[PDB]
């Protein structure tokens, strides 16, 4: 049978392999008829230059538009032949091509996925088809208040580093961008060790590694500054006013990365539409549900290579914005002093819950494996997670959060009707209790 | 490990279970009472009933629940459709029993306190609003209203004049009428059969009474048009397909994947879909076309839901529509048939793999059939689809009465007589 500790123990473990030129391989076997095959590259925006800015997201489109051996829309008709779905997506630190398909068709799968990574037909017929689509998306992307307001947040905190910039880059580059830079950008960042292959499904390791297949792969971080600042785009038309507040935090591999995972579970999150009511446990989900001080808010946690961001994101009506900010800083400050053993548990449990339920399904597993290798190295420390959790103790939390919260310089970014959002020197004077 | 063990009771409530290796352990409970069981004066009840899961049980205060579940770190869900409401609940390997304890009390031992009902009233509007931001929602709910008379046309949401009209009695009656031990199905996943098998027989045995089937839905013609300021027309065009559990109900599923286009390649305009391609050649700038198929117990509908601009709307429909006639004229390609069936097998298997996704399809058979069908059987049933059958089936769509709904600027919209 299965007991909580026992259920950790029987899982197909990570497999690893090398090729000669620095490509990597890895996999797992779920005894399942379907499989995810993918590729995860570390070539990001924070590498790209000021002229190359946006090229990455630009390239991201062209790959499926036809390639060296299989011209335009000959490629797709083979994917739709298998009936396999096909996907790609980007991120500031990563880029991912992957396929969900039956275990059977895998022989073509890689050999297809192989080609797309490197050989790409680049035809200015496609470019002008593309250069519109982007100049179509940029102007629209104003329509989503969320995605915007983040692009405020980075630029305001990180100003003066390659990390401080948009993914897609300013519009003007989209016009001027010529496939010369692309080929250069292609040439630079797509070699191994950068590249990583992964997969999970009915695949066995060795039946992969042979058809890891006779193909080929290929032949920098500097730390970033933290600028305590503010930005306000004040626009009084719109009905509601977003806010985001954040403080800087550690990178991927680091012990404190776990402690803070738990805190932001405890403060919890509320939304308009929950069935919670006024009886919820999360002290901001009880209060802000009572009077609907804010329509909804979630806490986010983002960790880059050497750096991470902590903070929340909340929407509320303009007369109400003050009262969030206070009641917020109540929470962070009651943690760093007055926290308690009991309340820890309800935080601790949820993390065990979400961590595990995050592993259902083929792709979410595989997707994890991809970033992990680039991140922590090979480590997929599943059962170890639990072992790392029991580290967490009362004195653990209050020693951790005393670092990053108490008496710091926040980063505020907001989007109108911001007007009531207090002037900066209030917030800074609201981070540190005077004991009241 | 072990495969599906489903056990009738004398009571008639199906139970089934597996034993997993995972710390993931989840339970589900399905009931036959959906929207189709709301009556004229009875409207809007189900859509309230679905929000009340946190109210005070018979034995436990509404407070002790909500703090209780979260302390464990559990999660409770609710789901409805036009047919089967399902209370889903999930937690860690260990703690299920405390949580298995609450699941009953909610559905077994309700109490509706008039002062705890009235406070919840305003919630509906907040709920109803965020639902209709996607008009692709709001188009559908009109559609059923056009294509029926009595039952299925009912909304999944509460009409507005009906808001202050929900009395506890109405609830407390609709509880016991359409809840009964014949109509319910309890499905575990990671838990041993006997533990599950024990408690269910105890609490969930009530009556009798059952099942009030008087809805034949009586497919009947009609159409609905609506004029709003939005600049993008939506359109649906539907004729009556056949009921679930038929090679036809299988055949239509074959037919869609021929025409029916979900994106299989991100940003890729689907060239394998004859429909979206057959249009784009003779037409202009953005639009979208997709086939639409859904099947219920006594009947199911088939059609295609389109989006365009105000000018093109007239042509887009006529273009796509005649394209179907081509197929009804005998034009066919066996490879596409062979290709489509592959997509179907693909679309189905990848759909099932996820536990939750798997969990739903389990009981979906249960309340309908009462058995389990291994996916292999599905597969072998898939390829049984004949070519002329597909054609002949599509010959029914064109040859039979149709219905429509449209929301947006209608200036150029055709009517069902011009088609």
């Amino acid at each position: 049978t299965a007991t909580y500790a026992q259920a950790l123990q029987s899982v197909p473990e990570t497999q690893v392999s090398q090729l000669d030129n620095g490509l990597r391989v890895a996999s797992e076997q779920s005894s399942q008829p379907t499989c995810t095959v993918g590729v995860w590259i570390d070539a990001g925006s924070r590498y790209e230059s000021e002229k190359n800015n946006g090229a990455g997201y630009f390239v991201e489109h062209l790959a499926f538009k036809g390639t060296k051996n299989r011209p335009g829309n000959a490629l797709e008709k083979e994917v739709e032949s298998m009936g396999a779905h096909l996907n790609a997506y980007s991120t500031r630190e990563h880029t991912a091509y992957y396929i969900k398909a039956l275990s059977k068709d895998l022989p073509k799968a890689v050999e297809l996925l192989a080609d797309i990574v490197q050989n790409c037909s680049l035809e200015d017929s496609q470019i002008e088809k593309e250069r519109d689509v982007i100049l179509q998306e940029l102007q629209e992307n104003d329509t989503s208040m969320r995605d915007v307001v983040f692009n405020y947040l980075h630029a305001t905190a990180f100003q003066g580093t390659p990390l401080a910039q948009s993914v897609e880059g300013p519009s003007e580059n989209v016009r001027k961008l010529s496939r010369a830079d692309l080929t250069e950008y292609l040439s630079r960042h797509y070699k191994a060790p950068r590249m990583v292959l992964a997969a999970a499904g009915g695949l066995e390791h060795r039946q992969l590694l042979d058809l890891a297949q006779k193909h080929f792969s290929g032949l920098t971080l500097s730390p970033c500054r933290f600028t305590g600042s503010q930005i306000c785009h004040r626009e009084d038309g719109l009905p509601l006013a977003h806010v985001a507040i954040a403080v800087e935090g550690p990178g991927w591999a680091h012990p404190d990365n776990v402690a803070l995972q738990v805190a932001n579970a405890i403060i919890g999150h509320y939304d308009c539409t929950y069935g919670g009511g006024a009886h919820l446990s999360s002290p901001l989900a009880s209060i802000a549900a009572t009077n609907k001080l804010c329509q909804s808010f979630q806490t986010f946690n983002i960790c880059y290579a050497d750096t991470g961001l902590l903070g929340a994101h909340f929407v509320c009506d303009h007369m109400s914005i003050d009262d969030m900010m206070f009641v917020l800083q109540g929470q962070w400050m009651r943690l760093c002093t007055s926290a308690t053993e009991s309340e820890v548990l309800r935080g601790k449990n949820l993390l065990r819950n979400a961590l595990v339920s995050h592993l259902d399904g083929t792709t979410p597993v595989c997707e994890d494996i991809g970033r992990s290798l680039l991140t922590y190295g090979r480590r997929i420390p599943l059962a170890e997670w639990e072992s790392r959790i029991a580290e967490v103790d009362a004195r653990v939390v209050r020693e951790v959060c005393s670092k990053y919260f108490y008496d710091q310089c926040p980063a505020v970014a907001g989007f109108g009707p911001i007007e009531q959002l207090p002037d900066y020197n209030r917030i800074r004077s609201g981070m540190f209790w005077l004991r009241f | 490990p072990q495969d599906l063990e489903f056990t009738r009771l004398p009571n008639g409530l199906v139970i089934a279970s597996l034993e997993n290796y995972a710390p993931a352990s989840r339970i589900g409970l399905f009931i036959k009472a959906g929207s189709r069981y709301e009556n004229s004066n009875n409207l809007g009840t189900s859509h309230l009933l679905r929000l009340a899961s946190s109210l005070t049980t018979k034995g436990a205060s509404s407070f002790k629940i909500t703090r209780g579940i979260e302390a464990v770190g559990g999660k409770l869900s609710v789901t409805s459709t036009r047919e089967n409401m399902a209370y889903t609940v999930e937690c860690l390997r260990d703690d299920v029993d405390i949580l298995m304890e609450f699941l009953l009390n909610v559905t077994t031992a309700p109490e509706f306190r008039r002062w705890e009902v009235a406070a919840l009233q305003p919630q509906l509007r907040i709920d109803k609003a965020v639902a209709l931001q996607n008009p692709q929602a709001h188009v559908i709910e009109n559609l059923h209203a056009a294509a029926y008379r009595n039952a299925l046309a009912n909304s999944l949401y509460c009409p507005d004049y009906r808001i202050g009209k929900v009395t506890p009695v109405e609830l407390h009656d609709y509880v016991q009428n359409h809840f009964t031990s014949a109509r319910m199905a309890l499905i575990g996943l990671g838990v041993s059969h006997p533990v599950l098998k024990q408690v269910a027989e105890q609490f969930l045995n009530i009556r009798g009474g059952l099942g009030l089937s008087g809805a034949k839905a009586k497919y009947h013609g009609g159409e609905i048009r609506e004029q709003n300021g939005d600049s993008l027309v939506h359109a649906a065009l539907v004729a009556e397909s056949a009921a679930i559990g038929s090679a036809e109900a299988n055949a239509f599923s074959v037919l869609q994947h021929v025409l029916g286009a979900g994106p299989h390649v991100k940003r890729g305009s689907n060239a394998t879909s004859s429909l979206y391609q057959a249009v784009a050649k003779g037409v202009h700038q953005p639009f979208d076309v997709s086939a639409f198929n859904a099947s219920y117990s006594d009947s199911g509908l088939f059609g295609f839901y389109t989006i365009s601009q105000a000018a093109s709307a007239g042509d887009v429909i006529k273009a796509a529509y005649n394209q179907v006639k081509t197929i009804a004229q005998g034009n066919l390609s066996n490879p596409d048939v062979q290709a489509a069936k592959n997509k179907l097998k693909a679309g189905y298997l990848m759909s099932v793999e996820s536990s939750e996704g798997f969990l739903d399809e389990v009981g979906s058979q249960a309340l309908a059939a009462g058995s389990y069908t291994p996916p292999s059987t599905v597969l072998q049933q898939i390829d049984a689809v004949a070519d002329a059958d597909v054609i002949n089936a599509a010959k029914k769509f064109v040859s039979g009465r149709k219905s429509m709904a449209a929301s947006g600027n209608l200036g150029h919209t055709p009517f069902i007589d011009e088609l």
Binding site: - | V78, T81, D127, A131
Partner: peptide, 22 residues
């Protein structure tokens, strides 16, 4: 034309906000 994974739509409300579907 969206059922798209499965039959018609859904409504789900628990905690986590709400979910529509096709």
């Amino acid at each position: 034309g969206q059922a798209a994974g499965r039959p018609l739509v859904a409504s789900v409300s628990l905690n986590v906000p709400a979910s529509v579907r096709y």
